[PDB]
Every structure is written in C-alpha cells, then in structure tokens.
Amino acid sequence: SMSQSNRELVVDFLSYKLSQKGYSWSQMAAVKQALREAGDEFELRYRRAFSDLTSQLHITPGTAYQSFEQVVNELFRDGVNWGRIVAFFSFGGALCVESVDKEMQVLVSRIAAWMATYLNDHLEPWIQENGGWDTFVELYGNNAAAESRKGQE
Template identity: 35%
Template sequence: MGHILLSATAGSLDLREPAAGCCLPPRMIDLEFRYTQALAQDYLLHVLQVPQCETSPSKASKVLQDMALSVQEEVERRLKPWLDRIDVESIDTAKSIFNQVMEKEFEDGIINWGRIVTIFAFGGVILKKLPREPIAPDVDTYKEISYFVAEFIMSRMGGWIRQNGGWDNGFVRKFEPKSGWLTFVGVMGQLCEMLSLLKQFY
C-alpha cells in the first residue's frame, strides 16, 4: 500500500495515491456512507424548500446547507443561459452529467473541503433541472441523487475525510465563523473551476 501524499496546501490530498483507512470494517464504511448520504438528502430537501420535521439537522448539515446553497445560487446565476438550454429528463441523465463534470473537476487528484462543497452544490443544480411531479415533488428523485453524490464522495475521498477530522470536526471547524469568510473565498475559487468545466461539456 502506498503512502498518502499531502500537498503544500493544508488539508489537500493527492487522490492518485491510495487513501488510508481503506481497510476499515465494512460496517464502519457503511455508516460513513449513510451519514454522507444523509447530509446530501438534507441539503437537497433544503434546496427544494421541503420542511424537515422529524429531527433537527446536525451542525454539519446546517453548515453545509448554508455554504453549498451560496455556491449553487452563484452557479445558477452565472450559468443561467447554459442551464436554460439543457434538458435533464431522467435520473440516468442526471447521473451521467454529474459524473462527467465531477470526474473532470477531480482529475488533478486534489481534495479539499471547498471542492467537496461544490459536489453537493452541483447535486442541487441537477436536482432542480429534473422534471417535477405536481403531487409529490421529487420524493424519490432527491434520494437517488443523494445516493450517487454520496457514492462519488465516499469512493474517492472517504479516507481524506477521515484523516481531516470527519464531517463533525474537520468540516465544521473549517467553516467556523472566525474563518468562514476566508474559506468561502476559497470555495468560490473552486466554483470558477466548475463553471469552466460545465461549459466544456455542454
């Protein structure tokens, strides 16, 4: 097993090397996957403005909702002419577009929390492009999107997330108020990258 290489940028990992923690017990990996999927589901329900009555979201979920929605709104504002021209008629099309753009964004092998936020934001963009049912809007659709969002994240950066404190420690601390604005500037830098990638594909 190769060694993990950290870049000069704090909190970045070269994806081209095997990630530590890949030999965790299957149950632990499954719990991490389900937690990440729950974060994605919370965020997508937030995008749809669906009240979440059962339990209050975790701190990580609330922070993610604030940051990812800001990124998503900026994507939608800057790319409105492009987004108006594309049709996402099925969940298969949504997954194909999502995977193409995300694979391109991460082909340099570098991970950081800002880039991870853009994954959720783009999931929200894709969700809003899908047709909506008038009676029960997106009841199953948001769950399917949350699955492939979590699948992409955990298959490529699960080890990095563990090494960097996880969602409740690493992610939340990164976006604490004292450093939130600086971090947000970094996220918006990642957004500019994603905008150029979208224009290449569609």
C-alpha cells in the same frame, strides 16, 4: 412509528433554534448547518460569476447518470478540497431541482444515491486524511465563508 416521527420533529426544531444562538444539537447537526451555509454561499458566488447552465445539460433519464458522473469526475480531477466538496453538494442540489422542474421527480432519489455512493467510495479517504467533518465545521461553521467575503466588501 408515531413516537419516532414526533422525536425526529422535536430534534429538528431544537437543532434549528439552537443553531440560531450559536449552539448545536449534536456534531452531526453542526456539520449539516455549516454545509447548508457553505452551499448557500457557493451558489451565491457561482451565480454572480456565471450563468445558470443547468438547462444546458439537457437532463434526461437516459443521460442523468452519465451527466452527473462526468461533471463530478471533472470537478475532482485535479484533487479534492472542502470548497470542491461544497461544489459537489450544490451541483447535486441544482441537479435535483432541475429534475423536479422537468417533471422527473424520481431522479431526486437516484441523484441522492449517486451522491452518497460517491461520498462513500471516493471522498471519504480524503475526508479522513484531512480531519473529518469536524475540521470542515471548524473552517466553515458560523457562516465563515460568507463572512470572509463580507470582509472584503
């Protein structure tokens, strides 16, 4: 409704301005902001190493799911870790941007669902065995990865 949208807008803005000062609106908001930052950083490290190969997947409606499935299964074959989970979000992101680029906007909503389902059915086990997302925030909050790279520079 109108009250819900105003509330949601107040919450989003306050969450942002709090995180700008090192605070957080809520534990969820802190996870979201650490994850965005880790995404930015993973994409920066990826693009410095390798070329953007998204176009080379040749996304189509018929192939979109199997493409997603195969990249993600290969990403987690050897095991799971926070960095690989960040890679999974980034790939989902690159996958959605490509879908819009190639005028298949509707795949964004489907890619989002494939991602949530994979999180529920295949990553949650490991996530709960490894401290939950609060532990992720402990490792990646305050833009930790980007700083760990800025140190070596």
